[PDB]
């Protein structure tokens, strides 16, 4: 898929592709190799290396947010994984019924 | 009827090779010979002589246990002579290299079934060469033999030839466990990089190379192979860096080789001329 | 009470909202119910007499799709006798709801349940049989009809008398029991009281059944008189025909169908499906013909080899074994459907294409029943000798040494027994297995794959049979396909520790890797696919340990199979509560240290390690043949 | 990596093992018959006159027995059905 | 054997007891210990007589009455009476069986049973009654050493190598150390504290001997307490000086060729009356009286058709 996406990189930013990166990174996660995916996960967000556990996770792509989270769950810290969820979930049902345009 | 076989072990010998289909025509003869050789008469076999010579294309093809009956007819020297002659013709069939390698190997099994293991046994080395003639018997039947010599005794070399064939037989994890066991004996020196490479456990080879690449400067291999991990690791920066770091040491070999990976490297990071 | 009912609430109060969620999982569960199907039943068999639990469990019926329940039909049949009627009725009800379509799984166990010694079962049956009689009658009959002369043919009086006299004598010599010793014999008299109705019955009643009936009163003469003179005359009388008959039993081969059942030798072209073979999604395979020769394996009960024409025009070879209960394995095989489906989901388990073979299991008595038969398969046990014999090898030559060296074997200390078993196996060849396996396969890949297929299918029951604690695997306890290159299993009687629970020779190996099998794989085939495979297994279920939890605990608590306990022991829930932690001990991986829920591989390894111990090995039963 | 399977989803060897179980000649004898019958199932010049003579040989030469002779008829019949009188006059004078 | 101070007895499955004297080269006398392996050749340490342990029996014979018949073949047992030992009274006998319980015998009590029983847990490895002769110390197959009192019955459980036997916890007449030769082939050594009077004798680990790759059958203190000679399933005696625990003199019945026959194992390996001579029971059906110094056979006694595990060298002298 790299070699694929390597090509498919030449055209499109990962920043549209993200969904493609996911089950990829998912299977990459399922490859057990997170970092690479994680590295992409970074590039996916372009923000928030594991730097602070305190970084409010930017919702720019809620699923992408969702993504790394359970990776983080998979990862050593499942405490924050649980954590930002509710934070994000907070943000969600906050954003959700509010940011609604019918 | 040994004189017939003696004449046939002559006629089967005939002109080995000279060229290829003739080595096969030698067999085609030898077949039709073995046919006309009537086997032990065994008139049923003897019956086939003209019959297989009628045409009789697949009938003439086997003929498989024909030689068995003949090989069962002793003159063990003449047999061995023929066997050697065959083995020579089988070296000539190893030189064929194709057709008998199919057929003779087939004649191996049936014999090897007959007990009947007698001819040339073990002989397994060229048996592997036939099993190095082409592919899947040259795997399946080979791995058998491969393991089988491995049963006479283990060597990493065997293992090397061995766990390989698993994947040459597409049997991935069998290859591993072998190593896994082989770990428990063979062997530290045995280049687990090359293995991990062949394992396509790249991380393990990485340090393995690193380990050996700690030891000395690089075998263009090691840098490549180590960096071959990185590309397989997907890893760029290092893979990037190192060929960028060492572009100097490269032989035109290493050049041609690494430049690819190098092309892959900088491309990997979206540098271009770098790769280019 | 205060809590218990607050609990009773909280139990029910959380129960019924769960309940619908199940039927609302069963909304989407949809093609795998069972874990759900067991939940309800788990509840249905606890709180059902509570109305609220009764309420929605009545309700979810109308959402649920019948084939759901059509999974658990046998268990549903087993618990028909459950007293608290908010339970019992709806069983009958829902059964009576179920019976119309697809009786074909219902029928026979119901036709079996058509009789009960605890009557409530066959009552509601005779009830719902009657309720089912309304339409499928001829089949219900034809179900009964066949099963009528099935169960008859399934057991044979002369043998029954043969065994009984042996049995009776045991009570008579061992216990000096003459009293219940009638209850042995006189029901057989009371059997033959209903009369020999056939050739073989009558011709036996004639040529033999005389002394039986003759001495019958002599024993009743003895009852009142209490003087064995009435009885010891009765004995030789019995022995007279018997001591003859004993020798005269193995005259039975493939039976001429007139001697008992021209009655079935009638039976043709019924509306009625081939046993167990009907599935909801295909046309029935009706029974068309059965051969007038029907054959009997020479073995424990002289198990009875059956062959069945299908209405589809095939032949369905079955076997039959009297006086052996299927209800264990009746449900056990059922487990495997899931188990396959479990693997059916996993890609590599799918890619590696992993399964457990299975076959037709339909009890007739508790102790008899339909056993489908698949050729191309046999015990390793034979094959070994089959090797040995064609290889001109002395059978026990191994253990023959073990006496040669150590006739004191049973009396030895371990290190001895070890050294024996060492020195034994030290001196033993290991290739016997694979050699024919090579040979018996027409080519290498063919061979290879089979080896593979083996090596894999090996690992399955290797791991699986471990977690289920399925015991006594020795070259007889199972069979091996030749063509598919696959192990198969039988001899499932041990459930969990019953193999270690049993006193003499508890087998301390979690499942048999023994050197041949060990050797059977590719060179050092342990570490290869196998352990890695074993990982795959150990892997998958430690997700799905849930679904299996209810499965086990279900028939772990199977009442008709709870007296496995007393049988094993030679109250109800409480004892069978125990193992369900060992399960999770295993299922977690917390089995070894309750400190850890262990990794797959070491747990795998440790299980290997346990399976490794010569000590365990040399301790195992000899007929089990560890050195093999 | 699977679907090209999935989306796409004897007597020699049945004889290969018993070969040693008996006389190799017997097995040799045994193997003789099959390839013939195949060639019989095939229809050519030859539709296997010369071997029908050699078919004749076995039945004579083997003298018996039995069963591997059994399935041969069914061909021979359908061969004589397939016949194509030339073989008949033989087959006839042959089956004698 | 009656007047014979040096008594070297050799046994095994043989369904005999082949008596010898370490100075003979010649069979001294013969008992039949049958139905069973000989479990051990055990004379009351006073040389009163020899009770020879079988399967659900010991068999009392006598050193001093030649070729006798069992005074008591000791019953009330499941399997062998595996770990058999006397209170050095020689009347009072304290035996572990294959029962997994500790039998307290008064033998000159007419009763065929042990006057008391204590229950250990895992299958019994040994019996060593502490030099105080008030303390039972029993090993088991999970390697849980029951440290037990003849009187207050205290079960103290040492577990130097868990889950796996210490084949014997061995008693030097000092008990400065308690060295328990494991199953696995590594003998632990535990300094025995001097509260022995009140039955304390705590276990202070010194050495787990790198005794044997494979199983070490028995570690043997010199009764001197000087030397510790380690019997082996991989068939070697390694004498780790009870002081030093360095190999002093190996008996390697690894003889110079690896797998033959299981050429026989180091089972128990004698400290002679001077602890300068060492007898090796083995699979050999033989026993080899070597020299603890040099490992040199003085006299080897074959009588057997059966591997010799069981030895008695008794000098009450």
PDB file of N, CA, C and O in Angstrom, chain E residues 108-134:
ATOM      1  N   UNK E 108       9.345 -51.978  66.757  1.00  0.00           N
ATOM      2  CA  UNK E 108       9.213 -53.010  67.768  1.00  0.00           C
ATOM      3  C   UNK E 108       7.876 -52.932  68.477  1.00  0.00           C
ATOM      4  O   UNK E 108       7.556 -53.830  69.260  1.00  0.00           O
ATOM      5  N   UNK E 109       7.090 -51.891  68.220  1.00  0.00           N
ATOM      6  CA  UNK E 109       5.659 -51.989  68.431  1.00  0.00           C
ATOM      7  C   UNK E 109       5.132 -53.001  67.431  1.00  0.00           C
ATOM      8  O   UNK E 109       5.433 -52.918  66.237  1.00  0.00           O
ATOM      9  N   UNK E 110       4.361 -53.967  67.923  1.00  0.00           N
ATOM     10  CA  UNK E 110       3.923 -55.075  67.084  1.00  0.00           C
ATOM     11  C   UNK E 110       3.125 -54.583  65.889  1.00  0.00           C
ATOM     12  O   UNK E 110       3.088 -55.233  64.840  1.00  0.00           O
ATOM     13  N   UNK E 111       2.488 -53.426  66.028  1.00  0.00           N
ATOM     14  CA  UNK E 111       1.548 -52.954  65.022  1.00  0.00           C
ATOM     15  C   UNK E 111       2.237 -52.745  63.677  1.00  0.00           C
ATOM     16  O   UNK E 111       3.218 -52.002  63.574  1.00  0.00           O
ATOM     17  N   UNK E 112       1.700 -53.390  62.639  1.00  0.00           N
ATOM     18  CA  UNK E 112       2.291 -53.318  61.309  1.00  0.00           C
ATOM     19  C   UNK E 112       2.263 -51.916  60.727  1.00  0.00           C
ATOM     20  O   UNK E 112       2.808 -51.706  59.637  1.00  0.00           O
ATOM     21  N   UNK E 113       1.616 -50.973  61.396  1.00  0.00           N
ATOM     22  CA  UNK E 113       1.475 -49.619  60.896  1.00  0.00           C
ATOM     23  C   UNK E 113       2.448 -48.691  61.608  1.00  0.00           C
ATOM     24  O   UNK E 113       3.168 -49.078  62.530  1.00  0.00           O
ATOM     25  N   UNK E 114       2.480 -47.456  61.140  1.00  0.00           N
ATOM     26  CA  UNK E 114       3.282 -46.427  61.768  1.00  0.00           C
ATOM     27  C   UNK E 114       2.481 -45.854  62.919  1.00  0.00           C
ATOM     28  O   UNK E 114       1.298 -45.540  62.766  1.00  0.00           O
ATOM     29  N   UNK E 115       3.126 -45.721  64.070  1.00  0.00           N
ATOM     30  CA  UNK E 115       2.393 -45.300  65.251  1.00  0.00           C
ATOM     31  C   UNK E 115       1.756 -43.928  65.073  1.00  0.00           C
ATOM     32  O   UNK E 115       0.788 -43.613  65.770  1.00  0.00           O
ATOM     33  N   UNK E 116       2.247 -43.121  64.136  1.00  0.00           N
ATOM     34  CA  UNK E 116       1.654 -41.825  63.841  1.00  0.00           C
ATOM     35  C   UNK E 116       1.764 -41.559  62.345  1.00  0.00           C
ATOM     36  O   UNK E 116       2.545 -42.199  61.635  1.00  0.00           O
ATOM     37  N   UNK E 117       0.987 -40.587  61.871  1.00  0.00           N
ATOM     38  CA  UNK E 117       1.078 -40.128  60.487  1.00  0.00           C
ATOM     39  C   UNK E 117       0.978 -38.613  60.460  1.00  0.00           C
ATOM     40  O   UNK E 117       0.141 -38.015  61.140  1.00  0.00           O
ATOM     41  N   UNK E 118       1.840 -37.999  59.663  1.00  0.00           N
ATOM     42  CA  UNK E 118       1.659 -36.628  59.228  1.00  0.00           C
ATOM     43  C   UNK E 118       1.502 -36.615  57.717  1.00  0.00           C
ATOM     44  O   UNK E 118       2.055 -37.463  57.020  1.00  0.00           O
ATOM     45  N   UNK E 119       0.741 -35.655  57.210  1.00  0.00           N
ATOM     46  CA  UNK E 119       0.470 -35.575  55.780  1.00  0.00           C
ATOM     47  C   UNK E 119       1.246 -34.417  55.167  1.00  0.00           C
ATOM     48  O   UNK E 119       0.931 -33.247  55.401  1.00  0.00           O
ATOM     49  N   UNK E 120       2.246 -34.747  54.358  1.00  0.00           N
ATOM     50  CA  UNK E 120       2.892 -33.762  53.506  1.00  0.00           C
ATOM     51  C   UNK E 120       1.987 -33.572  52.295  1.00  0.00           C
ATOM     52  O   UNK E 120       0.919 -34.187  52.211  1.00  0.00           O
ATOM     53  N   UNK E 121       2.384 -32.723  51.348  1.00  0.00           N
ATOM     54  CA  UNK E 121       1.491 -32.470  50.222  1.00  0.00           C
ATOM     55  C   UNK E 121       1.939 -33.176  48.951  1.00  0.00           C
ATOM     56  O   UNK E 121       1.395 -34.226  48.598  1.00  0.00           O
ATOM     57  N   UNK E 122       2.946 -32.635  48.276  1.00  0.00           N
ATOM     58  CA  UNK E 122       3.326 -33.172  46.981  1.00  0.00           C
ATOM     59  C   UNK E 122       4.108 -34.471  47.169  1.00  0.00           C
ATOM     60  O   UNK E 122       4.620 -34.742  48.261  1.00  0.00           O
ATOM     61  N   UNK E 123       4.176 -35.311  46.138  1.00  0.00           N
ATOM     62  CA  UNK E 123       4.788 -36.628  46.315  1.00  0.00           C
ATOM     63  C   UNK E 123       6.195 -36.553  46.886  1.00  0.00           C
ATOM     64  O   UNK E 123       7.040 -35.783  46.431  1.00  0.00           O
ATOM     65  N   UNK E 124       6.427 -37.404  47.883  1.00  0.00           N
ATOM     66  CA  UNK E 124       7.529 -37.258  48.821  1.00  0.00           C
ATOM     67  C   UNK E 124       8.859 -37.525  48.136  1.00  0.00           C
ATOM     68  O   UNK E 124       9.039 -38.546  47.462  1.00  0.00           O
ATOM     69  N   UNK E 125       9.796 -36.596  48.286  1.00  0.00           N
ATOM     70  CA  UNK E 125      11.147 -36.850  47.813  1.00  0.00           C
ATOM     71  C   UNK E 125      12.018 -37.574  48.818  1.00  0.00           C
ATOM     72  O   UNK E 125      12.745 -38.497  48.444  1.00  0.00           O
ATOM     73  N   UNK E 126      11.982 -37.170  50.086  1.00  0.00           N
ATOM     74  CA  UNK E 126      12.983 -37.659  51.022  1.00  0.00           C
ATOM     75  C   UNK E 126      12.395 -37.758  52.423  1.00  0.00           C
ATOM     76  O   UNK E 126      11.260 -37.352  52.685  1.00  0.00           O
ATOM     77  N   UNK E 127      13.201 -38.326  53.315  1.00  0.00           N
ATOM     78  CA  UNK E 127      13.068 -38.239  54.765  1.00  0.00           C
ATOM     79  C   UNK E 127      14.458 -38.013  55.334  1.00  0.00           C
ATOM     80  O   UNK E 127      15.345 -38.854  55.162  1.00  0.00           O
ATOM     81  N   UNK E 128      14.663 -36.881  55.994  1.00  0.00           N
ATOM     82  CA  UNK E 128      15.877 -36.717  56.776  1.00  0.00           C
ATOM     83  C   UNK E 128      15.496 -36.185  58.147  1.00  0.00           C
ATOM     84  O   UNK E 128      14.984 -35.068  58.273  1.00  0.00           O
ATOM     85  N   UNK E 129      15.733 -37.009  59.164  1.00  0.00           N
ATOM     86  CA  UNK E 129      15.424 -36.680  60.546  1.00  0.00           C
ATOM     87  C   UNK E 129      16.619 -35.949  61.128  1.00  0.00           C
ATOM     88  O   UNK E 129      17.705 -36.525  61.242  1.00  0.00           O
ATOM     89  N   UNK E 130      16.405 -34.696  61.504  1.00  0.00           N
ATOM     90  CA  UNK E 130      17.497 -33.765  61.739  1.00  0.00           C
ATOM     91  C   UNK E 130      18.478 -34.359  62.747  1.00  0.00           C
ATOM     92  O   UNK E 130      18.078 -35.194  63.566  1.00  0.00           O
ATOM     93  N   UNK E 131      19.763 -33.985  62.703  1.00  0.00           N
ATOM     94  CA  UNK E 131      20.712 -34.535  63.686  1.00  0.00           C
ATOM     95  C   UNK E 131      20.183 -34.537  65.103  1.00  0.00           C
ATOM     96  O   UNK E 131      20.518 -35.437  65.880  1.00  0.00           O
ATOM     97  N   UNK E 132      19.334 -33.574  65.451  1.00  0.00           N
ATOM     98  CA  UNK E 132      18.622 -33.634  66.719  1.00  0.00           C
ATOM     99  C   UNK E 132      17.744 -34.873  66.843  1.00  0.00           C
ATOM    100  O   UNK E 132      17.357 -35.235  67.959  1.00  0.00           O
ATOM    101  N   UNK E 133      17.395 -35.506  65.726  1.00  0.00           N
ATOM    102  CA  UNK E 133      16.484 -36.647  65.685  1.00  0.00           C
ATOM    103  C   UNK E 133      15.126 -36.316  66.275  1.00  0.00           C
ATOM    104  O   UNK E 133      14.395 -37.217  66.683  1.00  0.00           O
ATOM    105  N   UNK E 134      14.810 -35.028  66.389  1.00  0.00           N
ATOM    106  CA  UNK E 134      13.470 -34.575  66.717  1.00  0.00           C
ATOM    107  C   UNK E 134      12.722 -33.968  65.538  1.00  0.00           C
ATOM    108  O   UNK E 134      11.544 -33.628  65.685  1.00  0.00           O
TER     109      UNK E 134
END
